[PDB]
Amino acid sequence: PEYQNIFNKVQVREPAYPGVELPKGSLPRVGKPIFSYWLGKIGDAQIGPLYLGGWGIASLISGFIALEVIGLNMLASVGWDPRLFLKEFFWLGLEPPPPAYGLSIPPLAEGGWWLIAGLFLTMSLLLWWVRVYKRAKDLGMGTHLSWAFAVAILFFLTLGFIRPVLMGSWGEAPPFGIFPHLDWTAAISIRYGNFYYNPFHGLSIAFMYGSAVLFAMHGGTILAVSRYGGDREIDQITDRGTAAERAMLFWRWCMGFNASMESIHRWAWWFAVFCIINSILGIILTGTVVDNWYLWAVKHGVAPSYPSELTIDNPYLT
Amino acid sequence: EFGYITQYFDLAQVTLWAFWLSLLSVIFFNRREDKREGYPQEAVQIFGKTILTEGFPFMPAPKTFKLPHNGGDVVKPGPERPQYDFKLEQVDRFAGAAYRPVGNPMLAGVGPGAYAVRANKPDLTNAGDPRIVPMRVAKHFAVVDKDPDPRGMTVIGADGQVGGKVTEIWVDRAEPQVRYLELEAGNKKKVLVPIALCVIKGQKREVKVRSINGIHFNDVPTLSNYDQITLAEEDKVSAYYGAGTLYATPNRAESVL
Amino acid sequence: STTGLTEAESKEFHGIFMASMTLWFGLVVLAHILSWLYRPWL
Amino acid sequence: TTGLTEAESKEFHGIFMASMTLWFGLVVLAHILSWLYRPWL
Amino acid sequence: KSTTGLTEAESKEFHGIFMASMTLWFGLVVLAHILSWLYRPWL
Amino acid sequence: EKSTTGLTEAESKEFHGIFMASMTLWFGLVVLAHILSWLYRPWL
Amino acid sequence: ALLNFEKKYRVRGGTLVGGDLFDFWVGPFYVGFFGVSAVFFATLGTMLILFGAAIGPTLNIWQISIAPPDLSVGLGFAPIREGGLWQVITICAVGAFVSWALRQVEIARKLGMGLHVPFAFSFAILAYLTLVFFRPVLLGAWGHAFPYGLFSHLDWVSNVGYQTLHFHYNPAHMLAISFFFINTLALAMHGSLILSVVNPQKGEEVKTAEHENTVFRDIVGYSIGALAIHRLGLFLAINAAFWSAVCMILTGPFWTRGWPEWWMWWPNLPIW
Amino acid sequence: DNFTGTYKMWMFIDPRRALLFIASFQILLGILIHMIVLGSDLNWHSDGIPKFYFPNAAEASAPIDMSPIPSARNFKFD
Amino acid sequence: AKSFDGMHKLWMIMNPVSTLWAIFIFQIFLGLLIHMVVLSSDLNWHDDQIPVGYQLQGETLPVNLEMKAALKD
Amino acid sequence: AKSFDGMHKLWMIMNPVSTLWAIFIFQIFLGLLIHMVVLSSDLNWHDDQIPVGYQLQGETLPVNLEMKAALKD
Amino acid sequence: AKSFDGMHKLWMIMNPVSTLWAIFIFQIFLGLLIHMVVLSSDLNWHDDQIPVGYQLQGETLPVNLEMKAALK
Amino acid sequence: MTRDTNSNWTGHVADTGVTCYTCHRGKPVPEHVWTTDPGPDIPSVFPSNGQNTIGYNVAYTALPFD
Ligand code: BCL
Ligand code: BCL
Ligand code: BCL
Ligand code: BCL
Ligand code: BCL
Ligand SMILES: CC(C)=CCC/C(C)=C\CC/C(C)=C/CC/C(C)=C\CC/C(C)=C/CC/C(C)=C/CC/C(C)=C/CC/C(C)=C/CC1=C(C)C(=O)c2ccccc2C1=O
Ligand SMILES: COC(C)(C)CCC/C(C)=C/C=C/C(C)=C/C=C/C(C)=C/C=C\C=C(C)\C=C\C=C(C)\C=C\C=C(/C)CCCC(C)(C)OC
Ligand SMILES: [Ca+2]
Ligand SMILES: [Ca+2]
Ligand SMILES: [Ca+2]
Ligand SMILES: [Ca+2]
Ligand SMILES: [Fe+3]
Ligand SMILES: [Mg+2]
């Protein structure tokens, strides 16, 4: 057939690019850039350099302290054996305090290490937030990447710090494992009567499906007009060429309305952020306001009603 | 009692209403941003009169892009540059009918061969230099061995005939990668072909261009200066190759089954 | 030739390739005879 | 091609074979000791 | 052809010091194991 | 060729003087805090 | 209505079936043979869903449900009131989805562009056909597919999940979820970056491609590129769909225990 | 001596980066040691010295994992 | 018997170094796989406790038995 | 007896440095793997309590026994 | 016995700096790994309560015993 | 115990009942029984939480194993 533009057939090298000049008073960039042939088959081949200033070092100290703690407790749970660590790795975890301790600080091997790791991971993510903000603002760009990051951090803090405090127990938070955190997911659905009848859960699922749909559509459309220079979106925005025109006619003819080369990126932004906004809203109300989502859905006229034919006798009533 | 009810109104309900209203309102703003290009639209009336309409919701107020290196201001939604001179005949006498090109379809600029009217300036780097340039002007580039160097190969043209030979590679300095191949055609002109319309076979040492035919490489649009390319010229070249996807053979626009 | 080898180079490579493959298969057969003597599986 | 001539290849081959033989000798010795200590078949 | 830029004299020098260092390291390892066997024999 | 920070030898001497003074003062305060803690709640 | 620049692109040709008979527009839409087909099948399917709601107990939007046949029908034909309506609607649905994809192909041919979007749509279609055709055929009955109803296909999803005691430990399910999550993250970052470069700090010029590369190399140390992020996008979404189809074809036809017990192959390797 | 030329250290190690590392590390280590000591028998906030100030539970067991969420606040588990 | 004469020409269309590497890698993967498949069957030779069980031998040493006796008191 | 004469020419088509690195890395990985495979079988030599069990030796020291006695009261 | 004569030429094809870094990193990783493997076996030397158990020693101090008596 | 179950618990074993063979199946010690699980070996100052292992009796999940 015709070239599909999925891999780079011919590669070219020039000396590495150090980066746009920073404002005066900045630290130098660390690292000497290297090139990857395999990364260059699909994208850009340069790796590095990297910018390490004040906020991105405090972050990376916090995060690595947290990682050391989590790893060592997982390793103590098998008796220090690395062979068993590799053998049973998906079943290990660091577990939260027993719920009877409330919001106090428990002893170290009965939930205090969980508390330490949570605190250090929190600080890591807030320092990283400041780094992302300043990096985009020192180059003179809008700070749109910090708004979305803030939303994600808020969801991490909701399930984990805010909801456990509003409930009165640290033992309501997830543990640090793979299968352990999957077990937490299932159990919190079972305890509060079926998350499928949580309406914010349904809306966030709507927006996660929509993210996949929209990004398949956009990735397809821009690869399909890259023969007319469509992959260069900044120029198509500030001087509309034939690639943008064809891209917008396609969708107009197909489904009756369209966006522009700049507006589709606002649709992307919002579809990714409403998913997490509804995530926060659905978790923050569970347990603190609603105790059984299925009974809520029945009270508000939402759940179907299968035919019965039988009678089952509740043995606690007999 | 298993399903006893204490009170009908709760917080989850109100919050859900608030969300329905917060969506339903970003739709409004995004739909308004969608109409900074291509509007007001042209509605054709009962007996052919055309008016400008604007849709629902209405168009936003204009905003300004300030382009770098004194590249001017762009207001959007704003004026438009004038279309060129396409000729078309309608096929059926109603507003929703299709059109046919009047002359030679390859040299008409209608259908998949239409193009836009951009600036007559090159695209720039962050330093002020032209962005897309031949590899003899950019003296620091090199093709990575492990990859077939296309310089020298031939340009078979979709009906098996030869179009010409590759003589240069055009690179992109802002993001290092190949954008165009330059070739000498059958009548000894220098023409470009986009790299995203070329299948390169290293062992056969061929480049297959499925879009147009071999004799069609003589009429590809040419450049003013061969040390740079402008936005307008990019559009013209690419559009000429795109017209062949429907006009090269008389059987290409003719219902597969 | 699409690999750049002439016919003489191909003959040379083929000679040594066949010798090496024969030696490898000999060692495999020996390993299986020992295993059958120790722990017969059929 | 690797850019080695035939003399360089001969040299490399000599030392490669010597090294591999010594390594296999040490392996055999380790296994004799292990069989004496804890026989597995 | 793959090369490191070292001449034959530089390689001889590097090799001398490399072998000395490796021998000293292995000596220290042997000493550690003799102490461990005296304290807690494992075989 | 070699990695440098642009400081001359005089600037390095100056920085070193003040760095060592500050570190000594900090360690002094640490020792004082630990003497108080040992007097209040001995841990060994 | 036509856009400012639209008229020079509305030419004839590019079709698959039909020819010059259905080559027109109605308003902004393009019709074609497959446009007629799609609207025909969508209308018929919708009207049959509504009738199946009319013969049920309620017209509440959340509680409508049309269910498939019983497992005793096998791969046969069910009565209209006990499963046959579901079969007719599920024929209409396939007809409409495939029509949609082929109409897309006609449009792209007319505008001179590549067929990436119908190709990516094909994988959604494949996941649907896995749930209604392939899995039911391998298990031997149409009554293994899901009913048509909001809130009522969710009961199906729940009970099918619990038929394996813990469906989170399904391997292809884990892989698909990984792709879904990474796709939302990537879409957020891409949206943010383009908006940020054409909407800079107040009183500044529009930035360039060098700025786009620099920002991510400063934060993270690697930047993938403006054309490869579109590729990465097509890739993550398609893979999500693909591994969903695999995870459902595995459950029932090729595995009948609990899903945690599959993973037992790993700690039983004789190498630890 | 042997440490005569140590001050030349700052001619190839950046003093700005050194300072930024040391401050961060010291503050984080402060927080860490305080939380570690609070999660042990040396804890000084809820140890009941010189007095228990809260209305604590009269009979608080040793908490296990299979537990419900507590009804009132309590800080005396031992 | 002369039907395999031109066989040496195989290396004029197949690259020798690529083929060598492919063969070596495939052989190593297959070696690991067959050893693991046979170790997971009745033919396993590491855990069969032949010629003797060594963990069991360690549990019944007189010193270990006498120490386990003095603890069960 | 004369089949393996030209064998030294192997290094004119295969890169010596790449091959050396590959061999070294593979050997280290295999060393770790075989040690881990034998440690997870009946042949394990760290936990077999031969020549004596040391945890058991620590649990029955007279000092530890006398301290555990004075806690039962 | 003269089979290993040209061995010193190894450093004309293998980079000395890369080799040094690889050796150092591998040695540190192996040190950590072997210490952890031996500590998780019957040879464990931190928790074996030899030469004495310290938690048990703290539970039976006369001061702690007299305080636990007056509570109970 | 067998007489008690056969007479007083028919809400569960309704008119089919149990004999010895229902559990011993011709052996003096039944095949599937349980005791209070101590858990894996961990450091001596670490209390058991009772989960996050393989868990052979709870269908190989990371759920509480006893
Ligand atoms: C029952 C087991 C024994 C035990 C049996 C052994 C045995 C056996 C050995 C060790 C060895 C070591 N043990 Mg011990 N060891 C025990 C308990 C401990 C404990 C502890 C917290 O309980 C610690 C912290 C150590 C720590 C150490 C390291 C000093 C050394 C590992 C070096 C290394 O990895 O370098 C690898 C890293 C490099 C080579 C990088 C190169 C850096 C250069 C060369 C400088 C490094 C300095 C180096 C670490 C030490 C040299 C010491 C000086 C002469 C003072 N052991 C228990 C009691 N231990 C090993 C050793 O002694 O090596 C000689 C060794 O063979
Ligand atoms: C039972 C245990 C004791 C206890 C035992 C100790 C011990 C032991 C120490 C502390 C130290 C500290 N304790 Mg205390 N501490 C207790 C209870 C508390 C409580 C509380 C809520 O109960 C608080 C808030 C504190 C807080 C503090 C900090 C003032 C100080 C940590 C400094 C630091 O983090 O490095 C920050 C360091 C830097 C940023 C780098 C160097 C500082 C430079 C010069 C610039 C920073 C400005 C300024 C000097 C900051 C410190 C202010 C004072 C003047 C020291 N402790 C209980 C009662 N605490 C440490 C200390 O005293 O340090 C002298 C210390 O050694
Ligand atoms: C107790 C239940 C189990 C569970 C049981 C199941 C079952 C059962 C299934 C999944 C499936 C999925 N699960 Mg699960 N799942 C659970 C928990 C999770 C969790 C989580 C956070 O816990 C996540 C993130 C997921 C995520 C997922 C996805 C991997 C997958 C759904 C995407 C998909 O199928 O696309 C595929 C896309 C389609 C099927 C869409 C079809 C599109 C059609 C062609 C177009 C329709 C157009 C329409 C009619 C037009 C309307 C037009 C209007 C004009 C607008 N599950 C719990 C543990 N899960 C599903 C799956 O993998 O199926 C393949 C599935 O069947
Ligand atoms: C009951 C089953 C038997 C058993 C039955 C068999 C049988 C049957 C076979 C083996 C074979 C092998 N067995 Mg065994 N084997 C058993 C237990 C073991 C144990 C152990 C921990 O218990 C180990 C580590 C091994 C390891 C090995 C390897 C030596 C060999 C596979 C090499 C390979 O695949 O190269 C693949 C890699 C390549 C081809 C790359 C290129 C190789 C180059 C040319 C150099 C490699 C050198 C060669 C491996 C070593 C032989 C050289 C001589 C010393 C001269 N077996 C038990 C006791 N084993 C195979 C064999 O012997 O091959 C001849 C074989 O057929
Ligand atoms: C019951 C089982 C026996 C046992 C049976 C065997 C058997 C059988 C063998 C070993 C082999 C090894 N055993 Mg043992 N081994 C046991 C317990 C141990 C313990 C321990 C913590 O209990 C350790 C740490 C070791 C460690 C080792 C290594 C020294 C050696 C593997 C090296 C390698 O992987 O090279 C791979 C890496 C390369 C080739 C890269 C290149 C390295 C170059 C060439 C130089 C490296 C130096 C080399 C590592 C040391 C040689 C120094 C002296 C001259 C001997 N064994 C128990 C007691 N062990 C193997 C061996 O001795 O090989 C000769 C071997 O055949
Ligand atoms: C049904 C009925 C009663 C029919 C009677 C009418 C008659 C008689 C005939 C009409 C003729 C025909 C054939 C009509 C068929 C159409 C009908 C009826 C229905 C289909 C409508 C339909 C399926 C719409 C669904 C719309 C939805 C929900 C979309 C989901 C995704 C979404 C929200 C997208 C918003 C963002 C957009 C607009 C993305 C498109 C878009 C993308 C993705 C880019 O990448 C891009 C790149 C550069 C420039 C522009 C773009 C661009 O616009
Ligand atoms: C052996 O390994 C070594 C040591 C060598 C290092 C290797 C590291 C490795 C292999 C690590 C593996 C890690 C894994 C698999 C981690 C899995 C993590 C997952 C999937 C986690 C999922 C969820 C956890 C969540 C959401 C936790 C949220 C916790 C929060 C928000 C904590 C909040 C606590 C706070 C803010 C502190 C309050 C404390 C205080 C003091 C105020 O209380 C009063
Ligand atoms: Ca106190
Ligand atoms: Ca054996
Ligand atoms: Ca032993
Ligand atoms: Ca000890
Ligand atoms: Fe984009
Ligand atoms: Mg758990």
Instruction: Please judge whether J45 and E43 are an interchain contact, meaning their C-beta atoms are less than 8 angstroms apart.
Output: yes
L42 Cα to the center of ligand 10, angstroms = 21
With the most atoms of ligand 7 within 8 angstroms of its CB, the residue from A65, A119, A279 to mutate is A119
CA gap G127, A212 in Å, rounded:
14
Q: Min CA distance, F32 vs chain H (Å)?
A: 16
Which among L40, L47, L61 has CB closest to A183? L61
Q: Cα(H10)–Cα(F18) distance, rounded to whole angstroms?
A: 12
What gap in Å lies between CA H69 and CA A169, rounded to an integer? 7
In the block, tokens 């269910």 appear at G67
> Which tokens sit at G44?
């018929």
d(CA E31, CA E26) in angstroms, rounded, equals 9
Decide if domain B101-248 falls under CATH 3.90.50.10: yes
Q: Residue I17, CB half-sphere, CA atoms under 13 Å: how many?
A: 15
Cis, bond preceding G253 (omega within 30 deg of 0): no
Q: Which residues of L touch A312 (CB under 8 A)?
A: none
B232 membership: H or E segment, kind and range: helix B231-247
Contact: J4, C12; criterion CB under 8 Å: no
> Which of H13, H31, H42, H54 best tests the A interface by mutation, with the highest count of A CBs <10 A?
H31
**Residue whose entry in the numeric block shows the structure tokens 């649990």:** J59
Residues of L in Cβ contact (< 8 Å) with A90: 62
Q: Is J39 on the interface with A (CB under 8 A)?
A: yes
Identify which of F3, F16, F41 has the shortest CB distance to residue H10.
Answer: F16
The answer to whether the CB of C15 falls within 8 A of the CB of J3 is yes
Q: SS3 string of chain G? A: CECCCCHHHCECCCCCCCCCCCCCEECCEECHHHHHHHHHHHHHHHHHHHHHHHCCCCCCCCCCCECCCCHHHCCCCCCHHHHHHHHHHHHHHHHHHHHHHHHHHHHHHHHCCCCHHHHHHHHHHHHHHHHHHHHHHHHCCHHHCCCECCCCHHHHHHHHHHCCCCHHHCHHHHHHHHHHHHHHHHHHHHHHHHHHHHCCCCCCCCCCHHHHHHHHHHHCCCCCCCCHHHHHHHHHHHHHHHHHHHHHHHCCCCCCCCCCCHHHHCCCCCCC
In the structure, ligand 13 is a single-atom ion and the residues with CB under 5 Å from it are A 180, 183; L 51
CA separation for the pair B156, B179 (Å, rounded): 19
Q: Which residue of D has its CA nearest to K13?
A: D12
**E31 vs chain K: nearest CA distance in angstroms?**
16
- Report yes or no: L62 and A93 within 8 Å, Cβ to Cβ: yes
The single residue listed with the structure tokens 């930024």 is H20
Spell out which residues of chain J touch residue I20, defining contact as CB-CB under 8 Å: 14
CA distance B148 to A9: 8
With an 8 Å Cβ cutoff, is K67 touching chain A?
no
Phi, psi of B208 (to 5 degrees): -95, 125
Shortest Cα distance, chain G CAs vs residue I44, angstroms = 9
Chains A+B touching (3+ CB pairs under 8 Å): yes
Domain carrying residue C28: 1-42
CB G116 within 8 A of CB G231: no
User: Does D40 touch chain E if contact means CB atoms closer than 8 Å?
Assistant: no
Identity of the residue numbered A212: A
Q: Which helix (H) or strand (E) holds C23?
A: helix C7-38
Helix or strand (DSSP H, E) at J62 = helix J62-69
Asked if residues C3 and I13 have their Cβ atoms less than 8 Å apart, the reply is yes
Helix (H/G/I), strand (E/B), else coil: H5:
coil
The verdict on the CB of residue C31 being under 6 Å from ligand 4 is: yes
Alpha helices in chain A (DSSP H): 37-42, 55-76, 82-87, 112-138, 144-157, 163-167, 179-191, 199-224, 233-238, 242-255, 263-284, 293-299
Q: Are strands A176-177 and A93-94 parallel, antiparallel or unpaired?
A: antiparallel
This PDB structure is determined at a resolution in Å of: 2.8
Length of chain I: 73
Give the span between the Cα atoms of A318 and B45, in whole angstroms. 78
Determine the Cα–Cα distance for residues A122 and A114; give it in Å rounded to an integer: 12
Q: Which residues of E touch J19 (CB under 8 A)?
A: none
Distance of CA A17 to the CA centre of its chain: 30
Q: Is I10 close to C10, i.e. CB distance below 8 A?
A: yes
Q: How far is the CA of G230 from the centre of ligand 12 (A)?
A: 7
The distance of G258 to chain I (nearest Cα, Å) reads 22
Residues of chain A contacting B119 with CB distance shorter than 8 Å: 239
SS3 content of chain L, % helix, strand, coil (to 5): 15, 0, 85
What's at A90, amino acid-wise?
F
3-state secondary structure at position A35: strand
Indicate the burial class of K6 (C-beta count within 10 angstroms; 0-12, 13-18, 19 or more).
middle
Domains identified in chain F, total number: 1
Find all residues with CB under 8 Å of I28, minimum gap 6, and list them.
Answer: J26
Distance CA G107, CA J32 (A): 59
Asked if B63 contacts G202 with a C-beta cutoff of 8 angstroms, the reply is no
A 10 A CB-CB count for A309 gives 5
Question: Any idea which residue has 């391998």 for tokens?
Answer: G138
Element (H, E) at A176: strand A176-177
Decide if J20 contacts D19 (C-beta within 8 A). no
